């Protein structure tokens, strides 16, 4: 449909250097969806 109009991943991101001592990773709750909604 135009080639350039296809395969665009606009809404994606990436990063390196895992750890980052100072972070908001505490996230005890929130992001609670239970994607394993089976059985």
């Amino acid at each position: 449909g135009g080639s350039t109009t296809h395969f665009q991943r606009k809404r994606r991101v990436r990063d390196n250097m895992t750890k980052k001592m100072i972070t908001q990773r505490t996230i005890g709750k929130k992001k609670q969806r239970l994607n394993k909604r089976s059985y």
Binding site: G1, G2, S3, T4, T5, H6, F7, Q8, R9, R11, D15, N16, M17, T18, K19, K20, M21, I22, T23, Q24, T26, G28, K29, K30, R33, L34, N35, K36, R37, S38, Y39
Partner: protein, 1095 residues
């Protein structure tokens, strides 16, 4: 002789009380083979006999409940009805005459489980005796029978088949009456819990929610009364209600909020009760923010409570000497308050939270207590993400105030200031760095280099890491020298201290900071390479003992990042030694668990070294591929327990439990999931980097990643498994078409099934993108008939879901609680839906390009929905993608597409004049592709399409950054119609106007087409382009020079050469070239020279 059997049963129960392994095994072996009916009769006899010890009775009751809930299907049917009636009557009799509370509750659990397992069919109780007993139980005098009835009701809230028809009023009256007595508090708590469970079970029932609203004051009074008796059982029910069904609280929400505030402000209660009371409001903010935003007073009163929680810091003298990053607690008041502040700021939004917390923070940052300043800095750190847009215009004074606290008399306040700076750099990126680098870098470096406290230094280094990670490379080069100095001297000092003492806290942060600086500086780190590599290797060779494993992993990661930054040329002088170090480490450490910190740092190091060492790395592939595949296919431990059993496993070694429906607990061990995600991503990177060299390991990776598509425990694993699909096909392409077909037969069914099943929108979009890419890899026969049918069904379901979600969102609007933030959430959902539609169009384009005219009968079933997408009243995102799909149909499935032209041709002709630039672009591309791959059938429509296209092109506001792309597409369409259909265009009149619109510069694949047309006209003869003699040549030369700039790729594309030769075709007589080039800008002359040199 039943007496001997009972004696043996009591003996084995007594053995089970204090088992040890021997009688553990022997009792399990003896018990697992007992006949089911004999088991039921024996357990009932044991429960009835009130002579043995309470432990035996309780243990037997637990056995009966577990046996029922596990294997009711094999110990009840196909048995005499007399036995069933006898056991039911026995259970009711034991319930009636039981006196001890615990045993009565256990038998209530047993009876509720039986009634749950004896419903069957569409839902109708087969045990009317149980319901009758419950009704005559709750309306009685003795409190034991009422407790039994309420516990039966709570355990299975739903022993009914016609509750709405007749029994709703009776249930409401029973619960109201039970939450009214003043002599037995235990009845009130049980009734409140029963009401909460009944409301939770009957979810998605607005009528029930409005009919049961009169019970809320009693529930709130019950939880208030219970929380003062060291019993938070009802508070947990309130938290569950607020989490799952907040609308139930809407009648009395204010009252509820006030109660929580009281329960959060009362110091008499322990920490857990106050934290749960706060969690009520926090969960309400997270789940139902629109309902809570109306009560601003409650938020304005709850913010001081959380701020006063964070002042609850214990003066610890064993702080500055701590050498490990000990876990915070997640139980102390300060951490819970900070987390609650973060969650509420994220949920309610900054527009409401910021005005009431800003003044509190600014007032607390002045209190001479070292605890109020710490709390203020931590609140500033916490509210950073939630109040993002509102704090973006106030960042200057906040930063200037925070940076003044790095020079503070108290070390903990400086630690908090470093935390605030680092968290603000993380949240406000990359705008924080550009406007504040000059002061932030200087302050952090000054704090790091001159300090007597070794916990402020490490946290300042971590803040520097957070700052430099997102800092663009352009504005860091001036600071590279002043970073390498003050990062190398401190490394030297800390490495000296590491040999004598055992200090590692600040050395790890310094190493990570150097790694981050090198990573973000890339090739500019070469002059400083020799400053760091000899020392870093010295850390890797040493630090071989335990409790330095994190240091070794960080040093190895830093070495890998520095090597990747400096490139292969400079790295290939110590690369052999680093390879030996990594090999020795890999062969040494490979004896520990999967939570060893050197199991996520070694894999990424190996992948980085693969990136550095390209194809030479193939030698080391067998060594790395072992442990990577071992840790990429770990199966997490999962257990399906009962809720009454879940409590009993309170060891909590890492078990994460979720309360499944109807008294069940589902637990998974989240130990190694992140390592699995890292290993899968590194497998994807390995395949991408190696291509043909990965063919030996392609089969194992395919057989591992195909099941991982249905791995719902981690989204990253599923995303990596989806991404690896086309890369592995490209790797296996080398072995021939048969190997490709085998791998595709492995992957195709799994991908198709995962497309129509994935809950997550992002993972689903990635899966659809990967499937489209895989189809693009293998064309003309990659799908069977079964795959075609399944794909058609799934795509029709997806389009129907997309159409229905718009109506569902419209119903979501016009609600009792709708504001701006709800609209923003709905817009985000709309964006996700449009992305899924984009991926659907991608899959359709791949299928069309692969199959051509043979796939139209399959597209017949999807045609009505695509026609629906192009409806004039639809939003522009739907119309654009419908037109794109029809353009694909035209390009690849012609000249048979005339059968479908009545559906799209008139909308295509109409939409060229649309207000939306994207719909205009799609319609223009469709009109252009009509002439090129349409044949003689679409001949008369080009005559109609041309005037509309020229009208769109010649209109004003056509070259602005918005409508420019649509105008470029229209120009390309007119050029294609002129070239491939010159009979009905009158080219001699359009071409002089067409030359004015040239060239194109932001559309690349249309630019090559239009320049191919320009060359074809030039290479052929006079018309238009070259008029009298060669006087027109200068304007075409100017057009070419203007279009030179990164438009025709200088990699010797077929078009560019045809252009360049033309420039060299005129470069024969100096007379014409001089006059053609005399009226060009110096940039144009340089462009012409570069174009001539490039091809």
């Amino acid at each position: 002789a039943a007496a001997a059997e009972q004696q043996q049963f009591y003996l084995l129960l007594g053995n089970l009380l204090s088992p040890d392994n021997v009688v553990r095994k022997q009792a399990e072996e003896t018990y697992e083979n007992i006949p089911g009916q004999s088991k039921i009769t024996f357990l009932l006899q044991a429960i009835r006999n009130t002579t043995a010890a309470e432990e035996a009775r309780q243990m037997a009751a637990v056995l009966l409940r577990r046996l029922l809930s596990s294997a009711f299907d094999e110990v009840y049917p196909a048995l005499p009805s007399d036995v069933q009636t006898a056991i039911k009557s026995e259970l009711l009799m034991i319930i009636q005459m039981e006196t001890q509370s615990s045993m009565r509750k256990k038998v209530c659990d047993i009876a509720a489980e039986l009634a749950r397992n004896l419903i069957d069919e569409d839902g109708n109780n087969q045990w009317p005796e149980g319901l009758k007993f419950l009704f005559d139980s709750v309306s009685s005098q003795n409190v034991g029978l009422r407790e039994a009835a309420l516990h039966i009701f709570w355990n299975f809230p739903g022993i009914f088949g016609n509750q709405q028809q007749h029994y709703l009023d009776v249930i409401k009256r029973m619960l109201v009456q039970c939450m009214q007595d003043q002599e037995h508090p235990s009845i009130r708590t049980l009734s409140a819990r029963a009401t909460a469970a009944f409301i939770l079970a009957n979810e998605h029932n607005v009528a029930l929610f409005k009919h049961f609203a009169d019970l809320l004051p009693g529930f709130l009074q019950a939880v208030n009364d219970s929380c003062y008796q060291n019993d938070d059982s009802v508070l947990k029910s309130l938290v569950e209600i607020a989490d799952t069904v907040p609308k139930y609280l809407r009648p009395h929400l204010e009252a509820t909020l006030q109660l929580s505030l009281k329960l959060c402000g009362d110091t008499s209660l322990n920490n857990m009760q106050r934290q749960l009371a706060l969690e009520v409001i926090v969960t309400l903010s997270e789940t139902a923010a629109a309902m809570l935003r109306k009560h601003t007073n409650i938020v304005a009163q709850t913010i001081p409570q959380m701020l006063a929680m964070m002042v609850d810091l214990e003066e610890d003298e064993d702080w500055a000497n701590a050498d490990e990053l000990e876990d915070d607690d997640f139980d102390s008041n300060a951490v819970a308050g900070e987390s609650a502040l973060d969650r509420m700021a994220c949920g309610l939004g900054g527009k409401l939270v910021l005005p009431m917390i800003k003044e509190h923070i600014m007032q607390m940052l002045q209190n001479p207590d070292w605890k109020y300043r710490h709390a203020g800095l931590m609140a500033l750190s916490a509210i950073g993400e939630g109040c993002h847009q509102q704090m973006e215009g106030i960042l200057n004074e906040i930063v200037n105030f925070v940076l003044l606290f790095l020079q503070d008399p108290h070390p903990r306040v400086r630690y908090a200031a470093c935390n605030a700076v680092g968290q603000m750099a993380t949240d406000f990126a990359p705008g924080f760095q550009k406007k504040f680098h000059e002061k932030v870098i200087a302050a952090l470096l000054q704090t790091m280099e001159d300090q007597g406290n070794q916990r402020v230094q490490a946290h300042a280094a971590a803040a520097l890491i957070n700052f430099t990670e997102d800092c663009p490379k352009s504005l860091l080069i001036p600071y590279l020298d002043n970073l390498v100095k003050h990062l190398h001297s401190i490394m030297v000092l800390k490495l000296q201290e590491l040999i004598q003492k055992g200090t590692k806290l600040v050395l790890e942060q310094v190493v990570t900071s150097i790694a981050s600086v090198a990573d973000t500086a890339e090739e500019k780190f070469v002059p400083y390479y020799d400053l760091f590599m000899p020392s870093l290797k010295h850390i890797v060779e040493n630090a071989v003992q335990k409790e330095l494993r994190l240091l070794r992993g960080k040093t190895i990661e830093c070495i890998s990042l520095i090597g990747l930054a400096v490139g292969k040329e400079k790295f290939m002088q110590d690369a052999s030694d680093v390879m030996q170090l990594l090999l020795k480490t890999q062969t040494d450490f490979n004896d520990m668990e999967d939570d060893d910190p050197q199991i996520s740092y070694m894999i990424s190091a190996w992948a980085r070294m693969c990136k550095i060492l390209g194809k030479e790395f193939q030698q080391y592939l067998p060594v790395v591929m072992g442990p990577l595949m071992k840790t990429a296919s770990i199966k997490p431990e999962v257990a399906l327990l009962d809720t009454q059993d879940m409590e009993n496993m309170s060891d909590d070694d890492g078990w994460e439990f979720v309360n499944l429906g109807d008294q069940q607990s589902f637990g998974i061990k989240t130990a190694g999931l992140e390592e699995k995600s890292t290993a899968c991503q590194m497998l994807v990177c390995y395949a991408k980097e190696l291509k043909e060299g990965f063919v030996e390991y392609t089969e194992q990776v395919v057989k591992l990643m195909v099941p991982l598509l249905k791995f719902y425990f981690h989204d990253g694993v599923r995303v990596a498994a989806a991404e690896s699909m086309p890369l592995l096909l490209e790797c296996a392409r080398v072995r021939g078409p048969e190997y490709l077909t085998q791998m595709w037969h492995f992957m195709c069914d799994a991908l198709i099934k995962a497309i129509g099943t994935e809950p997550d929108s992002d993972v689903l979009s990635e899966i659809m993108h990967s499937f489209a890419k895989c189809i693009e890899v293998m064309g003309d026969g990659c799908l069977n008939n079964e795959h075609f049918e399944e794909l058609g069904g799934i795509l029709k379901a997806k389009l129907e879901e997309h159409f229905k979600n718009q109506e569902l969102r419209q119903v979501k609007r016009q609600d009792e609680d709708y504001d701006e933030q709800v609209e923003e959430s709905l817009q985000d959902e709309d964006d996700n839906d449009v992305y899924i539609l984009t991926k659907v169009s991608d899959i359709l384009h791949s299928i069309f390009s692969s199959y051509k005219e043979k796939v139209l009968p399959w597209f017949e079933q999807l045609l009505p929905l695509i026609v629906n997408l192009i409806c004039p009243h639809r939003p522009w995102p739907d119309r654009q993608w419908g037109l794109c799909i029809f353009d694909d149909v035209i390009e690849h499935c012609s000249p048979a597409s005339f059968k479908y032209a009545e559906y799209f041709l008139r909308p295509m002709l109409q939409y060229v004049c649309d207000n939306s630039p994207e719909v205009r672009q799609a319609a223009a591309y469709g009109l252009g592709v009509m002439a090129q791959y349409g044949g003689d059938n679409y001949r008369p429509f080009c005559t109609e399409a041309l005037p509309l296209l020229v009208r769109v092109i010649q209109s004003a506001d056509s070259k602005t950054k918005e409508n420019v792309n649509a105008t470029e597409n229209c120009i390309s369409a007119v050029g294609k119609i002129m070239k491939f259909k010159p009979d009905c265009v009158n080219v001699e009149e359009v071409l002089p106007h067409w030359l004015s619109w040239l060239p194109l510069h932001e559309d690349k694949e249309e630019a090559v087409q239009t320049f191919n047309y320009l060359c074809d006209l030039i290479e052929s003869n006079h018309p238009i382009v070259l008029g009298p003699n060669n006087t027109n040549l200068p304007k075409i030369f100017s057009i070419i020079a203007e279009g030179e700039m990164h438009e025709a790729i200088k990699h010797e594309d077929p078009c560019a050469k045809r252009l360049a030769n033309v420039v060299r075709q005129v470069q024969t007589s100096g007379g014409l070239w001089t006059e053609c080039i005399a009226q060009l800008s110096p940039e144009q002359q340089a462009a012409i020279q570069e174009l001539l040199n490039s091809a």
